[PDB]
Every structure is written in C-alpha cells, then in structure tokens.
PDB file of N, CA and C in Angstrom:
ATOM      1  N   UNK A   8       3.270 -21.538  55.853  1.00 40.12           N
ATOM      2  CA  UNK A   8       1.921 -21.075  56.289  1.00 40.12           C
ATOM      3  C   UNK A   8       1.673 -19.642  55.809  1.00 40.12           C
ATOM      4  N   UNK A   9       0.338 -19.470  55.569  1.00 39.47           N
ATOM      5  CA  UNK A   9       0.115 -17.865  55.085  1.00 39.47           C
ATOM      6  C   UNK A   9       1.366 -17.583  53.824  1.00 39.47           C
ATOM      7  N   UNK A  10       1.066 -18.699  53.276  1.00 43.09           N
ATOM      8  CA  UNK A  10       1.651 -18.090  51.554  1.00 43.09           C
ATOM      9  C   UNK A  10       1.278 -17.044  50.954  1.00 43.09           C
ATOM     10  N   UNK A  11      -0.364 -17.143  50.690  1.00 41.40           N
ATOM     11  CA  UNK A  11      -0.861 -16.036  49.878  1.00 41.40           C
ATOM     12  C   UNK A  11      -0.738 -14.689  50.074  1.00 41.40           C
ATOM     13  N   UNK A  12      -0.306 -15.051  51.757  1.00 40.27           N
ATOM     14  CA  UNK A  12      -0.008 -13.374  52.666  1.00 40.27           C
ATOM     15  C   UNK A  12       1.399 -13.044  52.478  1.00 40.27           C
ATOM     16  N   UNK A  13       2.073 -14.092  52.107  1.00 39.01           N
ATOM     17  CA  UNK A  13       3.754 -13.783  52.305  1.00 39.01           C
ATOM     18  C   UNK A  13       4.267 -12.957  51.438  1.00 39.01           C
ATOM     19  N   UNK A  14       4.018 -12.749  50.257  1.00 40.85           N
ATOM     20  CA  UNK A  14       4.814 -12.094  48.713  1.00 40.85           C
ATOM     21  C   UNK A  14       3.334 -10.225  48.978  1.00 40.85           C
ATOM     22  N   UNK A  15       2.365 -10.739  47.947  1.00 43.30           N
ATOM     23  CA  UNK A  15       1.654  -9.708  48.194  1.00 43.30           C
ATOM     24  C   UNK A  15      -0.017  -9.923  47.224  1.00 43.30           C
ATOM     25  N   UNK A  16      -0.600  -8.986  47.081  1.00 42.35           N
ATOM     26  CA  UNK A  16      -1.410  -8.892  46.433  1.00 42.35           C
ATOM     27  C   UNK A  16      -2.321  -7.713  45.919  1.00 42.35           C
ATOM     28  N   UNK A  17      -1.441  -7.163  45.306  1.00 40.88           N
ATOM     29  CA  UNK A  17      -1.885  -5.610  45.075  1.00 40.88           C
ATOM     30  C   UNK A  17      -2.737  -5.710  43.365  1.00 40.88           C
ATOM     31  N   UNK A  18      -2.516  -7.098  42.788  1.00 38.22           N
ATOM     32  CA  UNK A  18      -3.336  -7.332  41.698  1.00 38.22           C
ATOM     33  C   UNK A  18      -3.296  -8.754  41.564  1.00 38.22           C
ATOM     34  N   UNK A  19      -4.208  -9.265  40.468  1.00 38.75           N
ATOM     35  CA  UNK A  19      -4.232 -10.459  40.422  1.00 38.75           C
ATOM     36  C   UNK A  19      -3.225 -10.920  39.195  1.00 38.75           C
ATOM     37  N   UNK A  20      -2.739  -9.818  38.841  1.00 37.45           N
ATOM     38  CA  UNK A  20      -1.651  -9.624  37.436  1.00 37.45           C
ATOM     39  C   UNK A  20      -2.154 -11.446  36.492  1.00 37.45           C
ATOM     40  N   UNK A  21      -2.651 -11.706  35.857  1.00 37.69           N
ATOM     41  CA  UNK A  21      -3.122 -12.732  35.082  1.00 37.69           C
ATOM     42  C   UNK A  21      -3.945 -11.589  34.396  1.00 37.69           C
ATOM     43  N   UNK A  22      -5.241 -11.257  35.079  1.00 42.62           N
ATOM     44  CA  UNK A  22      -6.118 -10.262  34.928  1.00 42.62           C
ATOM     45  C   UNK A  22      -5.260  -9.401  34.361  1.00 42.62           C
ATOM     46  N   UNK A  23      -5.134  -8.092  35.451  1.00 43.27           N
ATOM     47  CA  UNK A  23      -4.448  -6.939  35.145  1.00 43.27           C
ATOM     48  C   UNK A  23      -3.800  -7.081  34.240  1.00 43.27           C
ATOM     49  N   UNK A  24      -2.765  -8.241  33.681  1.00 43.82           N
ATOM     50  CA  UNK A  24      -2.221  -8.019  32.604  1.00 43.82           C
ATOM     51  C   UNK A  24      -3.196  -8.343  31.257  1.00 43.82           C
ATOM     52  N   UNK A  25      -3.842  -9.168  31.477  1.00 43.27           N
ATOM     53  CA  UNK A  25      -4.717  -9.392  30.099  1.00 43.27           C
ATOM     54  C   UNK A  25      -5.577  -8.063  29.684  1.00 43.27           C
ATOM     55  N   UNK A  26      -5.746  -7.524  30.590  1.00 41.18           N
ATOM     56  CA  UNK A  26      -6.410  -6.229  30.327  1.00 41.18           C
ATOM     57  C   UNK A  26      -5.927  -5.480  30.125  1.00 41.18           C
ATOM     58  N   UNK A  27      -4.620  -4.828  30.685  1.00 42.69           N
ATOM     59  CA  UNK A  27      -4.067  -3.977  29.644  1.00 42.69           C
ATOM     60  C   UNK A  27      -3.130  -4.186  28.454  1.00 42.69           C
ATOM     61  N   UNK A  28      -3.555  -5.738  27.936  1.00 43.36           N
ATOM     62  CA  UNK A  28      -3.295  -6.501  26.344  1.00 43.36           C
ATOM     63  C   UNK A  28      -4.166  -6.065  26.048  1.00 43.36           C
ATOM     64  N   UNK A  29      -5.535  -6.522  26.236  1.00 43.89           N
ATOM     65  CA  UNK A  29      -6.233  -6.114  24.849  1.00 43.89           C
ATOM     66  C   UNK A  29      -6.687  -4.499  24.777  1.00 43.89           C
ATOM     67  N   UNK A  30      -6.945  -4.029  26.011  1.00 46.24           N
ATOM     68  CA  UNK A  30      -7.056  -2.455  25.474  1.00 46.24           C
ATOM     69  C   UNK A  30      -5.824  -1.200  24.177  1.00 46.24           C
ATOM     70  N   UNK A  31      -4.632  -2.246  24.702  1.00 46.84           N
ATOM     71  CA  UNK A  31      -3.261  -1.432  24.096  1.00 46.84           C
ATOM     72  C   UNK A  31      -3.735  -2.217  22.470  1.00 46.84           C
ATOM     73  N   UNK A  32      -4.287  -3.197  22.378  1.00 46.29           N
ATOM     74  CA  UNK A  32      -4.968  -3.794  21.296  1.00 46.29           C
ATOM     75  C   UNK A  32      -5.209  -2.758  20.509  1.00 46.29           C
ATOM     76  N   UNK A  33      -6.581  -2.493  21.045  1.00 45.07           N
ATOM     77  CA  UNK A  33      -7.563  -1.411  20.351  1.00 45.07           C
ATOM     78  C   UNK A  33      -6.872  -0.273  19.735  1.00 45.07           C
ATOM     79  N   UNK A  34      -6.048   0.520  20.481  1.00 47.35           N
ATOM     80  CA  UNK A  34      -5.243   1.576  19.872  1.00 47.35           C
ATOM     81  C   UNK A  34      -4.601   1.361  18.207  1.00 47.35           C
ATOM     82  N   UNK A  35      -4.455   0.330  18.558  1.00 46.35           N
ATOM     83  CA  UNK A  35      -3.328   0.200  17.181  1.00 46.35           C
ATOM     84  C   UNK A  35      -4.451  -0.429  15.882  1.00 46.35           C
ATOM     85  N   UNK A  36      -5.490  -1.204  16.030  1.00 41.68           N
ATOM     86  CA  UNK A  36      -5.929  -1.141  14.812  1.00 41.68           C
ATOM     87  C   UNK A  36      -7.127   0.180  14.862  1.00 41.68           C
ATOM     88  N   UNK A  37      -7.409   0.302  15.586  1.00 46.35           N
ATOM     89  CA  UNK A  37      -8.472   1.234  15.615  1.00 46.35           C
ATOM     90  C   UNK A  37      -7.624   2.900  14.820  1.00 46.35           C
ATOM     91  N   UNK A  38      -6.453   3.126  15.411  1.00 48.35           N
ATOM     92  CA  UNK A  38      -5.389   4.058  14.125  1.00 48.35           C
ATOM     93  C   UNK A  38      -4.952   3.226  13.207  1.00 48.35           C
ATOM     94  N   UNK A  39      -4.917   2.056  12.703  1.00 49.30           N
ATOM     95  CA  UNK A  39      -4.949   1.296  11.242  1.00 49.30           C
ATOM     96  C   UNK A  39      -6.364   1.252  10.547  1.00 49.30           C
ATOM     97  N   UNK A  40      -7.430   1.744  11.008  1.00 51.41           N
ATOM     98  CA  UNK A  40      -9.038   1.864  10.703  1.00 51.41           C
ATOM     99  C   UNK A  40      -9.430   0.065  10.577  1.00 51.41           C
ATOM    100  N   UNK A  41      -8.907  -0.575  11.733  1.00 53.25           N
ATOM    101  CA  UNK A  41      -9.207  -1.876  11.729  1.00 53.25           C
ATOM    102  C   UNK A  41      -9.908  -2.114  13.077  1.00 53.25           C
ATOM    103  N   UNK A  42     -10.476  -1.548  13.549  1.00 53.49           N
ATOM    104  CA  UNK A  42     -11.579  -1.278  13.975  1.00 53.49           C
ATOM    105  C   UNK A  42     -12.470  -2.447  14.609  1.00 53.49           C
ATOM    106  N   UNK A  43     -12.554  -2.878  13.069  1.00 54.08           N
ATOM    107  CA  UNK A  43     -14.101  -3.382  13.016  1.00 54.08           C
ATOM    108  C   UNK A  43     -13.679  -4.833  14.061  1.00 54.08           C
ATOM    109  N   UNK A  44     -12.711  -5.439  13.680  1.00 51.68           N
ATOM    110  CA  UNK A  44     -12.307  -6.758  14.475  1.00 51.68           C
ATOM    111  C   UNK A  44     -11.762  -6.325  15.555  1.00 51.68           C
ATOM    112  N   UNK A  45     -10.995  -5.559  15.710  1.00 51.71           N
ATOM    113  CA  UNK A  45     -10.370  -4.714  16.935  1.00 51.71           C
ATOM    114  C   UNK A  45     -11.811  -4.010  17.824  1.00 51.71           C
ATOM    115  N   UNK A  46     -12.176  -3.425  17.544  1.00 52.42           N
ATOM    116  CA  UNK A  46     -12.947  -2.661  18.565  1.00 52.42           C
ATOM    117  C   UNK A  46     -14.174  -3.456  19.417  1.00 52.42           C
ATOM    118  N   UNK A  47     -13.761  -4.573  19.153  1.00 54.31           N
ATOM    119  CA  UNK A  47     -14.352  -5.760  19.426  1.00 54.31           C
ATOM    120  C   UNK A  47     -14.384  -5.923  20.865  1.00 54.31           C
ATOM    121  N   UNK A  48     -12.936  -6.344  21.020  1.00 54.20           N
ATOM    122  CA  UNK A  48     -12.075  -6.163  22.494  1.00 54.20           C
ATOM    123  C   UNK A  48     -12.929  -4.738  23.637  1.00 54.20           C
ATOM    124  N   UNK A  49     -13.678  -3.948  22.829  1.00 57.84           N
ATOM    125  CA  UNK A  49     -14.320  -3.073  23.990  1.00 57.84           C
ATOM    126  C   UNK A  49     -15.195  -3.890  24.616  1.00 57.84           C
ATOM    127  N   UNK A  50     -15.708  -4.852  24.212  1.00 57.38           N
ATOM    128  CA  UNK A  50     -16.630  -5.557  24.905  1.00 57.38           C
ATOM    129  C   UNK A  50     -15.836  -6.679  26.300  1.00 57.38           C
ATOM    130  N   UNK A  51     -14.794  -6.957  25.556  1.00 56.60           N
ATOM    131  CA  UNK A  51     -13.703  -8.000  26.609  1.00 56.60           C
ATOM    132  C   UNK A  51     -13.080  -6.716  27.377  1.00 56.60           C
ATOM    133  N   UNK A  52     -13.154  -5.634  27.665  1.00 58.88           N
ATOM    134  CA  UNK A  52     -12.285  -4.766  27.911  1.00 58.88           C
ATOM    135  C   UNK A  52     -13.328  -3.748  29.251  1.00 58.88           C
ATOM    136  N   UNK A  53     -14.356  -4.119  28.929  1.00 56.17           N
ATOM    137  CA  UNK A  53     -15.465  -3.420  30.180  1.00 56.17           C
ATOM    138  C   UNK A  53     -15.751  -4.600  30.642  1.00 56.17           C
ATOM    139  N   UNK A  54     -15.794  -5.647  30.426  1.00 57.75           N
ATOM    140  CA  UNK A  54     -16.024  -7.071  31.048  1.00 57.75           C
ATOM    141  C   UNK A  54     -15.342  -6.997  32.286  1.00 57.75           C
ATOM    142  N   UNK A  55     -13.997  -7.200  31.468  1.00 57.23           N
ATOM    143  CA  UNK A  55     -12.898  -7.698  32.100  1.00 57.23           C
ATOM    144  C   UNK A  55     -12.615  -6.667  33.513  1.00 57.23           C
ATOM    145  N   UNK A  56     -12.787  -4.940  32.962  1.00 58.13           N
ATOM    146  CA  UNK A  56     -13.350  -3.950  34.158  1.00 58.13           C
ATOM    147  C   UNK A  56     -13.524  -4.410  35.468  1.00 58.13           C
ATOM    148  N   UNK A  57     -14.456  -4.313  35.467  1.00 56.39           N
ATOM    149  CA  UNK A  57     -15.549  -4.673  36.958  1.00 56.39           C
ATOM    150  C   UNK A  57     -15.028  -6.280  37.253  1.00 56.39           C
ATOM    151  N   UNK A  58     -14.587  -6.994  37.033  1.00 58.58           N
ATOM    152  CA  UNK A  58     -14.078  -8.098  37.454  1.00 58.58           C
ATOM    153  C   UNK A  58     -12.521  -8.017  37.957  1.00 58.58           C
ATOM    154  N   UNK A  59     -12.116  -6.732  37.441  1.00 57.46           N
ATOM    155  CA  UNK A  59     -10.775  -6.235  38.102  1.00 57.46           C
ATOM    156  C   UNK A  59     -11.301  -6.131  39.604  1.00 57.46           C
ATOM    157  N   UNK A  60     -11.996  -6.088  40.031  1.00 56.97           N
ATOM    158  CA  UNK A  60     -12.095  -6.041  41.609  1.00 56.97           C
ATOM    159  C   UNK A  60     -12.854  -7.463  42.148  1.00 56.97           C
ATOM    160  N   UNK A  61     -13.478  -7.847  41.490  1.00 61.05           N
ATOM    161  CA  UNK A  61     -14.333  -9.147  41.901  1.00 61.05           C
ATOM    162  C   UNK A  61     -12.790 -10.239  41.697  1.00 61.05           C
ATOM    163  N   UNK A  62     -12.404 -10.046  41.463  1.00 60.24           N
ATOM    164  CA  UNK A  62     -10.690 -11.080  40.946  1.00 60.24           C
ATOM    165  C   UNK A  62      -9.779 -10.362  42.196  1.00 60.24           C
ATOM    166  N   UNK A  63      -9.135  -9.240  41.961  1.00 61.60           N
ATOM    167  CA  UNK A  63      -8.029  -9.005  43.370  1.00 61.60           C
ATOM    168  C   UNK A  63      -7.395  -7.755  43.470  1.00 61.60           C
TER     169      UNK A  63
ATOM    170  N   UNK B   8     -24.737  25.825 -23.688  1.00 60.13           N
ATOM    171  CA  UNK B   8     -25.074  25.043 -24.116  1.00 60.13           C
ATOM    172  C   UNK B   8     -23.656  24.257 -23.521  1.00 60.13           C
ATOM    173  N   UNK B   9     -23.594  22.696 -23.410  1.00 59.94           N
ATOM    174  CA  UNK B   9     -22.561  22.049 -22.496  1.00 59.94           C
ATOM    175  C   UNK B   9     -22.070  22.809 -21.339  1.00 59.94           C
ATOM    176  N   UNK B  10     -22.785  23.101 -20.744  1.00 61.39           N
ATOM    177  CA  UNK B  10     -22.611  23.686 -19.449  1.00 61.39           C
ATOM    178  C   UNK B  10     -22.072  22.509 -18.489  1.00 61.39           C
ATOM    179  N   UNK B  11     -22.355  21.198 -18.228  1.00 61.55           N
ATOM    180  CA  UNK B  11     -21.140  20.347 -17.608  1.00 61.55           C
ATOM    181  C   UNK B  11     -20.177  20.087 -17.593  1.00 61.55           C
ATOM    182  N   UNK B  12     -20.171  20.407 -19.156  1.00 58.58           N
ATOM    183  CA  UNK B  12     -18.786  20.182 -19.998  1.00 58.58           C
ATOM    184  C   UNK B  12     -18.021  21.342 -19.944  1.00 58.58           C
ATOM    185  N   UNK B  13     -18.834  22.954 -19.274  1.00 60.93           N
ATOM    186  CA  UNK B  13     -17.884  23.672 -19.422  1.00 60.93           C
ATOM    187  C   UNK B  13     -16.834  23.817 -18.209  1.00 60.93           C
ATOM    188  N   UNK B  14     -16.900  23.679 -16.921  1.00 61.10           N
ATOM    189  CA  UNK B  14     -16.118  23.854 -15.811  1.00 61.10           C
ATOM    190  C   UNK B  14     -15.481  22.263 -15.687  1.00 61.10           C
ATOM    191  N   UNK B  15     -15.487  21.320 -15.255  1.00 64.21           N
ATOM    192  CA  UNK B  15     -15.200  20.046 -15.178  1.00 64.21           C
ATOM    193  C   UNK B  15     -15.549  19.103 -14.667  1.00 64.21           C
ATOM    194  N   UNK B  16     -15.503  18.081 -14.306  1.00 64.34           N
ATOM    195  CA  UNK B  16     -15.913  16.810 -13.648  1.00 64.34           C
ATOM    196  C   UNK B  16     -15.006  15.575 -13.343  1.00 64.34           C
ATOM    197  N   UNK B  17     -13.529  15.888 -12.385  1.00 64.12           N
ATOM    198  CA  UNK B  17     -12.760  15.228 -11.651  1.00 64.12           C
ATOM    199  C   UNK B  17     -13.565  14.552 -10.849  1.00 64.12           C
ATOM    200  N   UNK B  18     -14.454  15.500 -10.113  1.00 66.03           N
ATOM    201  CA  UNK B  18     -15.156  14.209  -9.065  1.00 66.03           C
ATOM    202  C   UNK B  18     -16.578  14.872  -8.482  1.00 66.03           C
ATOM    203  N   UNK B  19     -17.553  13.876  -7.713  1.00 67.60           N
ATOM    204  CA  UNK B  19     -18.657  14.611  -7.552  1.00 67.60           C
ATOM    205  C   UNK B  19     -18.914  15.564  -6.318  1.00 67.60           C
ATOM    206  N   UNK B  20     -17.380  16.061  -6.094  1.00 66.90           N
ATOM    207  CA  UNK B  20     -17.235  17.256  -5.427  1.00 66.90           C
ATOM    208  C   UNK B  20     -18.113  16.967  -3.567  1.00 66.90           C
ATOM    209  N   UNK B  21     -19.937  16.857  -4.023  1.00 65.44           N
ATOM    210  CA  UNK B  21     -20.735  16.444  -2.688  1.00 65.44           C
ATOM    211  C   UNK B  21     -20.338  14.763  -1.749  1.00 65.44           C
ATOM    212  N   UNK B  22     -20.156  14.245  -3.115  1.00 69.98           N
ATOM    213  CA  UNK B  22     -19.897  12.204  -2.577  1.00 69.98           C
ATOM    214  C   UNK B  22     -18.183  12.530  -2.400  1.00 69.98           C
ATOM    215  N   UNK B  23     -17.304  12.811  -2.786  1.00 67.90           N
ATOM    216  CA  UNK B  23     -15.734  12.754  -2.981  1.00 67.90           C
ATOM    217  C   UNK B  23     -15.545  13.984  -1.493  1.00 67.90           C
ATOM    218  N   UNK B  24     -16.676  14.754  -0.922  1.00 70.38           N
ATOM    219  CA  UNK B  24     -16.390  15.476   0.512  1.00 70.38           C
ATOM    220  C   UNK B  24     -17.242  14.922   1.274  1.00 70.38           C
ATOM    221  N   UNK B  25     -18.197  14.258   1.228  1.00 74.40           N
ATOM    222  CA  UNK B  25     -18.798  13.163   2.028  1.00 74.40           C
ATOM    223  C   UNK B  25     -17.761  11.745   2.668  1.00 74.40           C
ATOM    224  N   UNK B  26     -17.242  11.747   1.543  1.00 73.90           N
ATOM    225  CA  UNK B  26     -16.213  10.369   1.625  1.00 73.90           C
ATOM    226  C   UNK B  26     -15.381  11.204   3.038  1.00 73.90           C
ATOM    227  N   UNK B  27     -14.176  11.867   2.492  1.00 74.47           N
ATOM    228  CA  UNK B  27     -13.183  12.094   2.870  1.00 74.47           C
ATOM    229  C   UNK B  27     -13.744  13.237   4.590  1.00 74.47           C
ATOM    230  N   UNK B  28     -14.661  13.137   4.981  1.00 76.27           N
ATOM    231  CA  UNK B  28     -15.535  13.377   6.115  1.00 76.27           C
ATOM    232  C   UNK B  28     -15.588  12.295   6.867  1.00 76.27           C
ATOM    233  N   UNK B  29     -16.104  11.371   6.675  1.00 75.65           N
ATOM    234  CA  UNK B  29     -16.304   9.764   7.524  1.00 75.65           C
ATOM    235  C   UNK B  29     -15.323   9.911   7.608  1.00 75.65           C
ATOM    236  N   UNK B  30     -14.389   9.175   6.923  1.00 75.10           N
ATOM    237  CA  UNK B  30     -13.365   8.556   7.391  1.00 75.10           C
ATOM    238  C   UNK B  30     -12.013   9.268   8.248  1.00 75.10           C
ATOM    239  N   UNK B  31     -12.326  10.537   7.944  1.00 75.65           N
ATOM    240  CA  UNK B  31     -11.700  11.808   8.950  1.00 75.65           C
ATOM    241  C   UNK B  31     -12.128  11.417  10.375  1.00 75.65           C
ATOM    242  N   UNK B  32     -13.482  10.852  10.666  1.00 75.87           N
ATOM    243  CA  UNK B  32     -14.461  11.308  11.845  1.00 75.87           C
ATOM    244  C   UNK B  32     -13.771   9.829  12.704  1.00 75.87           C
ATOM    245  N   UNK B  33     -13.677   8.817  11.725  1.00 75.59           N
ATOM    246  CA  UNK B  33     -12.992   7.139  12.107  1.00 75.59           C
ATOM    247  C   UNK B  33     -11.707   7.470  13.353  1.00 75.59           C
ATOM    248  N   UNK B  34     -10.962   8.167  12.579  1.00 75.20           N
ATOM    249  CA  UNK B  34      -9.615   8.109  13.179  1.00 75.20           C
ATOM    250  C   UNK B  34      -9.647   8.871  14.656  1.00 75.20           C
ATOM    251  N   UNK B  35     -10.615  10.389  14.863  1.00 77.39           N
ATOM    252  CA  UNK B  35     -10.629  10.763  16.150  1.00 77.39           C
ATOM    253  C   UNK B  35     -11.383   9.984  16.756  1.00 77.39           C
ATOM    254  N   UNK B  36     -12.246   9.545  17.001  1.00 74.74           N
ATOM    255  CA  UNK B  36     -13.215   8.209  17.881  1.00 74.74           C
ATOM    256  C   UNK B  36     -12.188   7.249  17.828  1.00 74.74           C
ATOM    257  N   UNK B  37     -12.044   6.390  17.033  1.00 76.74           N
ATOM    258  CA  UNK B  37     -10.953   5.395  16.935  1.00 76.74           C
ATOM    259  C   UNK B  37      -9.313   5.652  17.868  1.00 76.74           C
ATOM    260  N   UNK B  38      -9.203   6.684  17.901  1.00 77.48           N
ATOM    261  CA  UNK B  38      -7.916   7.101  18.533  1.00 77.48           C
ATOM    262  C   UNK B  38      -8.700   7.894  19.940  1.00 77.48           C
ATOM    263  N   UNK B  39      -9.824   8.382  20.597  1.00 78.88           N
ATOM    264  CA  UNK B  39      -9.966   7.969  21.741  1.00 78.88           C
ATOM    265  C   UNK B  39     -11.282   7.226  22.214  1.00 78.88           C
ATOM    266  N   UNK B  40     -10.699   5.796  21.570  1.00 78.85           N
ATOM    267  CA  UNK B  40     -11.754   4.547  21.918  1.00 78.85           C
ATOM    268  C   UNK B  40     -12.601   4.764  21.796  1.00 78.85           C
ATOM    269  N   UNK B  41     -13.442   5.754  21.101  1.00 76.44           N
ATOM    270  CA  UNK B  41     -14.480   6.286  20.777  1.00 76.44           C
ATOM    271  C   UNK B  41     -15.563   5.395  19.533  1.00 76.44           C
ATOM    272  N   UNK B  42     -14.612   4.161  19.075  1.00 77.76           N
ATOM    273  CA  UNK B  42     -14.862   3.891  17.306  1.00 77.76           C
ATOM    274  C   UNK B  42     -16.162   2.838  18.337  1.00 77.76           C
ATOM    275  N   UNK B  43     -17.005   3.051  19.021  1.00 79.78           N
ATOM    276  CA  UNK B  43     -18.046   1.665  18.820  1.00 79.78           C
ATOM    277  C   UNK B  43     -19.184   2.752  17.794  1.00 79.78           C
ATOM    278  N   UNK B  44     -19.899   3.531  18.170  1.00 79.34           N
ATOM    279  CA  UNK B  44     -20.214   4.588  17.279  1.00 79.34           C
ATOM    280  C   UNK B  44     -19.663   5.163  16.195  1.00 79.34           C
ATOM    281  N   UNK B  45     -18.322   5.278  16.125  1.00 81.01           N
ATOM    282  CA  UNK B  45     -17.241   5.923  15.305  1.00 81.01           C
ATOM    283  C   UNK B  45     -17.604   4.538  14.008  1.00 81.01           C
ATOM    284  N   UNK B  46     -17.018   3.283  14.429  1.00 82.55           N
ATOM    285  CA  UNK B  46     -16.388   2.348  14.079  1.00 82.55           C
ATOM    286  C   UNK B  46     -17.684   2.314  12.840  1.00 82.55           C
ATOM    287  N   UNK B  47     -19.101   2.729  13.359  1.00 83.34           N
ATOM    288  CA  UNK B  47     -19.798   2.318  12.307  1.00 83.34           C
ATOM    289  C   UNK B  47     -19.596   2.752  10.827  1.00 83.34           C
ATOM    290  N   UNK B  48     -19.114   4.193  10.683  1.00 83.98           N
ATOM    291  CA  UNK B  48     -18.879   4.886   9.725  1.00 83.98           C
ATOM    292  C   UNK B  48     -18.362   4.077   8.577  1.00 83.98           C
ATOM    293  N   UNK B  49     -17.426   3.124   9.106  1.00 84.89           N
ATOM    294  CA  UNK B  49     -16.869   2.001   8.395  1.00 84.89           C
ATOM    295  C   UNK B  49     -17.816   1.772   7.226  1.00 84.89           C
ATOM    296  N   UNK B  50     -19.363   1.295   8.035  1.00 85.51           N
ATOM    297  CA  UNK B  50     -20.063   0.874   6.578  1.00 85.51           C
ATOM    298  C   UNK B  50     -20.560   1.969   5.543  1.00 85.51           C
ATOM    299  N   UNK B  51     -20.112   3.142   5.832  1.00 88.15           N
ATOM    300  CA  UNK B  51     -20.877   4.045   4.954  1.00 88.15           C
ATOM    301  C   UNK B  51     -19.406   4.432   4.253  1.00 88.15           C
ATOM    302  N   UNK B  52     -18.321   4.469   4.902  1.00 84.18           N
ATOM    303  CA  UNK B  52     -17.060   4.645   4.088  1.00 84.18           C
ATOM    304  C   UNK B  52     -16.648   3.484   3.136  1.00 84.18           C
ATOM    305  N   UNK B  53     -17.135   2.395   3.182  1.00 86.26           N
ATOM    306  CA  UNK B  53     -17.045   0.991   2.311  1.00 86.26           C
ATOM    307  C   UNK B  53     -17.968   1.647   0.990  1.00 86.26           C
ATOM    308  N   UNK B  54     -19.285   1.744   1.872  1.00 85.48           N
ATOM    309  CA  UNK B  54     -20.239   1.855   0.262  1.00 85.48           C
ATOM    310  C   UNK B  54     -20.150   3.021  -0.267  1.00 85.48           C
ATOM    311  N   UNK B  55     -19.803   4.124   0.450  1.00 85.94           N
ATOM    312  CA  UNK B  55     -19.805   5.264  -0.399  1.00 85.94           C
ATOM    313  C   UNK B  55     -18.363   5.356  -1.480  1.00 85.94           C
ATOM    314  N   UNK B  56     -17.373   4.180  -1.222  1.00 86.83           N
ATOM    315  CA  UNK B  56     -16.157   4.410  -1.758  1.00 86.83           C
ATOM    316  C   UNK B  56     -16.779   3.583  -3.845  1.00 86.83           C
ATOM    317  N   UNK B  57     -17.503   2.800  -3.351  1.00 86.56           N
ATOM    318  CA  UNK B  57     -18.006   2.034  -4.713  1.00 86.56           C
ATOM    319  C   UNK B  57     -18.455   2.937  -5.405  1.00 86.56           C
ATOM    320  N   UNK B  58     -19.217   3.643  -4.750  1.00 88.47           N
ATOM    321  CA  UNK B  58     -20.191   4.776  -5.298  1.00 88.47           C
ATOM    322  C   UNK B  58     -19.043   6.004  -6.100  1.00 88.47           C
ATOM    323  N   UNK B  59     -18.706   5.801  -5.875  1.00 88.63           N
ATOM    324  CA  UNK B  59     -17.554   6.941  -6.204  1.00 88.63           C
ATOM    325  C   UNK B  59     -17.482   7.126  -7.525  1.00 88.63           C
ATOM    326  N   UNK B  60     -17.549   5.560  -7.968  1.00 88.44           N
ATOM    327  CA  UNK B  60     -17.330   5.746  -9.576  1.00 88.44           C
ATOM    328  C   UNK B  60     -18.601   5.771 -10.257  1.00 88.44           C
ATOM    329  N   UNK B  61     -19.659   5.598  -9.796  1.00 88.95           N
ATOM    330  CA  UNK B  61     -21.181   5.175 -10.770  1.00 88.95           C
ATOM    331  C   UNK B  61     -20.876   6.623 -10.268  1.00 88.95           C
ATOM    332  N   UNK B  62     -20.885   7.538  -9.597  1.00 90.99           N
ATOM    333  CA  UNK B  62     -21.308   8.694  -8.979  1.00 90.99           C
ATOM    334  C   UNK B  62     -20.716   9.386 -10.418  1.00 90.99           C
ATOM    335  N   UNK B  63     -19.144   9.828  -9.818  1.00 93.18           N
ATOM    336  CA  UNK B  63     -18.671  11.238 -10.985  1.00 93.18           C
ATOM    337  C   UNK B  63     -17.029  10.978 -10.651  1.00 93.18           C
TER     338      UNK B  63
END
C-alpha cells in the first residue's frame, strides 16, 4: 500500500533525465559550430522546462 | 600607374575580416546557448565563405 509514497519523489527522473540529455546536447555541437541541427533541442529543452513541474 | 598591383592582393582584407568576425561571434553565443540568434550567422558565414574567391 502507498507505493508511490514508499521510495520517494523528488523528480520524475525519465523527465529530469531527458532534459539534462539534450541540453548537455547543445553544448557540444553548438562548440563544433553544429548548431544548426543541435540548437534545435532549445526548443525540446524550454518545452520540456515548464513541464518539469507539471510531471513531478 | 598599377597601383593594385603595387601593395598586394592576398585577400579582400574587408570580406576575409567580415568572415573571420561571424564566425568568432558563433562560438560565444553557441557556448552560452546563446546560438538561436548566434546560430543564424551560420548563413552569412556559408555565403560569405563562397564569396571569398569571386571577391579577392
């Protein structure tokens, strides 16, 4: 009973981790001037933002 | 008389410091997530690199 309460929930880590994948993304082509396909992820990356709290 | 011909013409000095400007400007935006604005430079560092040679 009360699983979801038993361990914890300080993130929804699925999220949290996908998000700080693709931002650590951006760094590396964006200093390779690859940018253009990379800087892409800013859009999945403010998305993904504000749903960090609407998620957990 | 050959006054072009008298100092030299390696490169067109204004387009060859235009160039090497953009793509200077890429890497600080780009390195703090800055490249959605930054990132555009891209297209003027593409065409101005062609230009390089019709140029000087």
């Amino acid at each position: 009973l009360e699983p979801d309460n038993v361990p914890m929930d300080m993130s929804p880590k699925a999220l949290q981790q996908k998000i700080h994948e693709l931002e650590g993304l951006m760094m590396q082509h964006a200093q390779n001037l690859e940018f253009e396909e990379a800087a892409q992820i800013r859009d999945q990356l403010h998305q993904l933002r504000e749903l960090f709290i609407a998620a957990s």
